[PDB]
């Protein structure tokens, strides 16, 4: 056989020139894409503002249209994906992960329109969903709809401008190449067989939609905390634990969003009246805590420096933690065109810095920062859920510049894993792929 | 699709069997990592005692600075064609081939070779990295442990191998998230689906990470204190950048590559042609290293001195050739050790120089020649070796610019775009089609 | 973030005085001073401008040395010496803070002034 | 060296008026900036790479132009925009600083 290897060897890193162009149009769209959204997601978010403030003296008044206005965008946005795209409504990742195996169709023509101005409103209102998976599956979209329009062919084009479309949308979200790159081949590809997927592809578009991320979000990252304190060799091991104890609280997360989804789907049964009403419902709820407890309410990443500073105090964080496990759940699970990929950050933020607190008065002669623990479980929560520990660590470094705490950042993402596998649980992204998957037999 | 649905339930299901010893592999690697390190030092010490000694006497000097590289330059050739041929060399094609069940792991034999038989090399003071010799060294310790605790399974023989060269590779530049892209952008068997285990591989690098920790702490390999920014208008100069490192990736390939073919004759194939022209070599690179080091030794030391911007355009183009010289002459002739650190080297200095230039060229950019030292820094990696990722991931764990990713990528990612355009090939891939062609037949 | 320069004043033709700029409210290294000048009356005529590490430092279409910036980070300071004055050195004084957009640099933000008048 | 000119050298109209004041380039210049003076004040950062009002400005403000000749505008100018405007360039070594335009209220 190894007469085959010395011939593919000599063939290494040939990918076709028609391809790689491709990804590039692809990360094109997919970062003004990924900006448009982004933009008009808070451009809503202002129209909440001039609508409570106008009404700011009437507090019944208020609490009313904060409940109105998330409400009737959330439910607008279960519309737009029970009645036009059933496949959008939730992360996207599952089903953009699955068809990357060839086991989910990319209906774009449906989808793009759908989970796009479908997550305006839903983000638009207040729900406690993320931007990402939005972003990553109206990523692949892009890259399936050149596919199509340009009718290119041979898994490879088909494999690899799906991809590049993730990533490309991943990168665009966080405003992190690296991690969009890191991502698709991680966690996106296929995870049991060889696949077609040209990584050189895959970067030309992640680039590509970093610079058009950058055309419109210059100077001004998206999570600023400084240069953090460093971190002794003798304090490794708190990072350690801080790892188990995600490790044990991620599969369970992952059993409660998983659940929570089911026992919410009673509630509508099916019925499309029965969810769009039931969509302005956690939507108007969120729209109300995003104006007399915002920590509990939205993305969460606002909240994600003020937690690494160490701002909040214990019982704050606390409150802030449960309080969005919860909205986070009801937002997720309840099938909103959203991500849970950002607020799980905000978790592991919150769930850190709670760690931090506790590890200062510990061992003052630690010299510790709670900061650092807030940042070495900033991805850990997405290293016990979806068990993604390099995309995680990877995505932070890449938005906290931290590096000086890279050793500490692996050590607890390590450990997430080390303990969300012996203790049950699974990739939360693999298993809802498994689950629709299956669903989509088992049912004829 | 009953398959797959039963395969996602599955996944990410590594035997604690195996975790366990990645992670004794990663430890092993490490403390191993470090005493090549701190040994080729100590020697590269001695040689100074020894001039100092004679820094009266100036043929003298030069007489001794060319004698001991040579001495120890051949004790390391050596005890690679009389023990070990497999290490001679980067030890990278190899350990690569021996993950596609292609080659052997003469552990046994490889380790002590490889190791002291690099202390040779390096400690005289050649041009030639640690890196490969590192990640080899690494497979073999993760093998050594596979054999000796016989955990059966191909799972257990590609992970305990792979995490022995990312432990190996990360204690070699500190630096572990490197280790690990690099296993699975490169190393890994590049065209069919294979049985290791990510997990595993982490648990070895930092394993090794915290054992390179243990004993370098409060001090960096390269430091470059934070640079410049760099606009999106000036972005396009790096482009150019890597298009330049692109035509040249190819090219530095085939001197390499046939570099190592016209060396060939001179020993033919003779222990006793070999050995002498080792320290022949070796004296040679041992002379440079007290009349111009920086075309001699590992080239890590003037990284920092070129992006700071201290070398003028004059001595850069001088150090270039010197080096591109000094390089393949050192590599090319089979001499156990890498061709991956001095690659850095000759970016950095190719980059640094290309800075120059666009600084007077646009002093309305105001430029910094010092980021474009490190848009580079590791593309010369990216038409060469064409390891992108794992470059750009490598030089930031080093250099600590994050600022600079959008263009490092720019560079790194045009590298590869010409690199492909215009022939040439994973100059590490070649060398095993090379190795295991010439092997059958 | 607050830019305060001082120096300025009375110099006789032919005179050598140095302008100080007193910078505070932001970190001085990562950015690019320089000076601009106003004629009363007249309009802004960039003087020079000195990277953060000094290693570089460019002046207007001046002459040898009339102009001399350079900085001393170690008191986030911004200097500018100016010999051989006369009349048409008679101007305001303003040290900026530069930076940038898509990259094509501006005066960022720009301190309060220092005069200097040429006269015996 | 750029040679900027900003056209009226001095204008006014009546708050609530569209006000439209020029800046040409000897040559060519992209992205250009605009800074603002008020009386007994050093410039201020208004406008920049052609039309990004800068955190503070008024949306009453826009940039424009392109290459060869940009401007300035108020729609529908408030007194207190009394001042001088500055177009200044820099997409061409050295920097280079318009003439000005005066600003005057009608009231």
């Known amino acids: 056989r190894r007469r085959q290897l010395i011939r593919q060897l000599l063939e290494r890193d040939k990918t076709p020139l028609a391809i790689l162009f491709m990804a590039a149009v692809v990360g094109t769209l997919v970062g003004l894409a990924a900006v448009a959204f982004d933009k008009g997601v808070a451009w809503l978010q202002n129209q909440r503002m001039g609508a409570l403030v106008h009404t700011a003296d009437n507090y019944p008044l208020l609490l009313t249209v904060a409940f109105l206005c998330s409400a009737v965008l959330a439910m607008f946005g279960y519309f737009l994906v029970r009645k036009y795209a059933p496949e959008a409504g939730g992360s996207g990742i599952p089903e953009i992960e699955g068809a990357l195996e060839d086991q989910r169709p990319v209906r774009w023509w449906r989808v793009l329109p759908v989970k796009f101005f479908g997550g305006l409103g839903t983000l638009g209102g207040g729900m406690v969903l993320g931007r990402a998976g939005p972003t990553v599956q109206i990523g692949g979209n892009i890259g399936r709809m050149v596919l199509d329009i340009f009718r290119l062919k041979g898994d490879e084009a088909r494999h690899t401008l799906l991809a590049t479309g993730a990533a490309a949308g991943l990168a665009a979200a966080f405003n992190a190449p690296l991690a969009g790159i890191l991502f698709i081949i991680e966690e996106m590809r296929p995870q049991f067989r060889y696949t077609l997927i040209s990584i050189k592809a895959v970067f030309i578009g992640v680039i590509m939609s970093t610079i058009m991320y950058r055309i419109f979000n210059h100077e001004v990252a998206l999570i600023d905390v400084g240069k953090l304190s460093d971190a002794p060799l003798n304090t490794l091991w708190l990072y350690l634990i801080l790892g188990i104890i995600f490790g044990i609280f991620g599969p369970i997360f992952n059993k409660w969003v998983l659940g929570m989804q089911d026992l919410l789907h009673r509630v509508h049964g099916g019925n499309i009246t029965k969810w769009v009403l039931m969509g302005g419902a956690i939507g108007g709820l969120c729209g109300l805590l995003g104006f007399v407890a915002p920590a509990t309410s939205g993305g969460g990443f606002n909240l994600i420096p003020i937690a690494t500073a160490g701002n909040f105090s214990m019982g704050m964080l606390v409150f802030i933690f449960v309080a969005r496990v919860i909205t986070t759940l009801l937002c997720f699970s309840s099938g909103a065109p959203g991500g849970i990929f950002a607020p799980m950050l905000a978790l592991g933020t919150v769930l850190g810095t709670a760690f931090g607190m506790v590890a200062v008065e510990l061992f003052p002669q630690y010299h510790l920062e709670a900061g650092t623990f807030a940042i070495a479980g900033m991805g850990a929560l997405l290293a016990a859920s979806i068990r993604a520990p390099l995309t995680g660590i990877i995505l932070v470094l890449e938005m906290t510049d931290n590096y000086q705490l890279i050793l500490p950042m692996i050590i607890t993402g390590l450990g997430a894993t080390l303990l969300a596998q012996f203790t049950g649980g699974k990739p939360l992204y693999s298993a809802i792929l498994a689950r629709t998957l299956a669903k989509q037999e088992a049912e004829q | 699709r009953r398959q797959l649905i039963r395969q996602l339930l599955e996944r990410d299901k590594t035997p604690l069997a195996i975790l366990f010893m990645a992670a004794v592999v990663g430890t092993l690697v490490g403390l191993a990592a470090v005493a090549f390190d701190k040994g080729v030092a100590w020697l590269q010490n001695q040689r100074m005692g020894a001039l100092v000694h004679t820094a009266d006497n100036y043929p003298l000097l030069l007489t001794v600075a060319f004698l001991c590289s040579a001495v120890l330059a051949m004790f390391g050739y050596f005890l690679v064609r009389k023990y070990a041929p497999e290490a001679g060399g980067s030890g990278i094609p190899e350990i690569e081939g021996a993950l596609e069940d292609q080659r052997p792991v003469r552990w046994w034999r490889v380790l002590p070779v490889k190791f002291f038989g690099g202390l040779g090399t390096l400690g005289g003071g050649m041009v030639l990295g640690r890196a490969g010799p590192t990640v080899q060294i690494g497979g073999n310790i993760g093998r050594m442990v596979l054999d000796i605790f016989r955990l059966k399974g191909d799972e257990a023989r590609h992970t305990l191998l792979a995490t022995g060269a990312a432990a190996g590779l990360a204690a070699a530049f500190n630096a572990p998230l490197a280790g690990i892209l690099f296993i699975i952008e490169e190393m890994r068997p590049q065209f069919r689906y294979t049985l290791i285990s990510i997990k595993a591989v982490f648990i070895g690098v930092i394993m090794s990470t915290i054992m390179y920790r243990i004993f370098n702490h409060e001090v960096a390999l390269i430091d470059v204190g934070k640079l410049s920014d760099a606009p999106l208008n000036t972005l396009w100069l790096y482009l150019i950048l890597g298009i330049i490192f692109g035509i040249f990736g190819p090219i530095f390939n085939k001197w390499v590559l046939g570099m190592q073919d016209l060396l060939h004759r001179v020993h033919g194939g003779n222990i006793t042609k070999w050995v002498l022209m080792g320290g022949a070599i070796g004296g040679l690179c041992g002379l440079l290293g007290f009349v111009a080091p920086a075309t001699s030794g590992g080239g890590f030391n003037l990284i920092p001195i070129a992006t700071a911007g201290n070398f003028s355009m004059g001595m850069l183009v001088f150090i270039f050739v010197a080096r591109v010289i000094t390089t393949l002459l050192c590599f090319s002739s089979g001499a156990p050790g890498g061709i991956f650190a001095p690659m850095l080297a000759l970016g950095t200095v190719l980059g640094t120089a290309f800075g120059m230039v666009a600084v007077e060229l646009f002093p309305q950019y105001h430029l910094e020649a010092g980021t474009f030292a490190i848009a580079g820094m590791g593309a010369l990696l990216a038409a060469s070796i064409r390891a992108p990722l794992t470059g750009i991931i490598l030089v930031l764990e080093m250099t600590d610019n994050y600022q600079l990713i959008l263009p490092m990528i720019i560079t790194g990612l045009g590298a590869t775009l010409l690199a492909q355009f215009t022939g040439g090939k994973p100059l590490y891939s070649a060398i095993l089609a090379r190795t295991l062609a010439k092997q059958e037949a | 973030v607050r830019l305060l320069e001082s120096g300025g004043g009375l110099v006789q033709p032919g005179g050598s005085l140095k302008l100080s700029c007193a910078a505070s409210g932001f970190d001085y290294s990562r950015y690019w001073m320089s000076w601009v000048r106003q004629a009363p009356g007249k309009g802004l005529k960039w003087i020079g401008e000195?990277?953060?590490?000094?290693?570089?430092?460019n002046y207007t279409p001046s002459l040898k040395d009339k102009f001399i910036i350079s900085r001393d980070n170690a008191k986030d300071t911004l200097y500018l010496q100016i010999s051989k004055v006369r009349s048409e050195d008679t101007a305001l004084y303003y040290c900026?803070?530069?930076?940038?957009?898509?990259?094509?640099?501006?005066?960022?933000?720009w301190g309060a002034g220092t005069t200097v008048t040429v006269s015996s | 060296d750029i040679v900027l000119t900003q056209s009226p050298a001095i204008m006014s109209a009546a708050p609530g008026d569209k006000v439209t004041m020029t800046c040409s380039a000897s040559?060519?210049?992209?992205?250009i900036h605009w800074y603002q003076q008020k009386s007994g004040t050093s410039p201020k950062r208004w406008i920049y790479?052609?039309?990004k009002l800068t955190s503070g400005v008024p949306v009453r403000f826009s940039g424009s132009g392109s290459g060869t000749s940009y401007s300035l505008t108020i729609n529908t100018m408030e007194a207190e925009d009394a001042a001088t405007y500055y177009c200044?360039?820099?997409?061409?070594?050295?920097?280079?600083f318009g003439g000005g335009t005066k600003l005057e209220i009608l009231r």
């Open positions: 900026a803070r530069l930076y940038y957009g898509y990259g094509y640099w501006y005066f960022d933000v």
């Open positions: 200044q360039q820099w997409s061409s070594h050295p920097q280079t």
């Open positions: 790479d052609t039309s």
């Open positions: 040559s060519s210049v992209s992205y």
């Open positions: 000195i990277n953060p590490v000094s290693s570089t430092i």
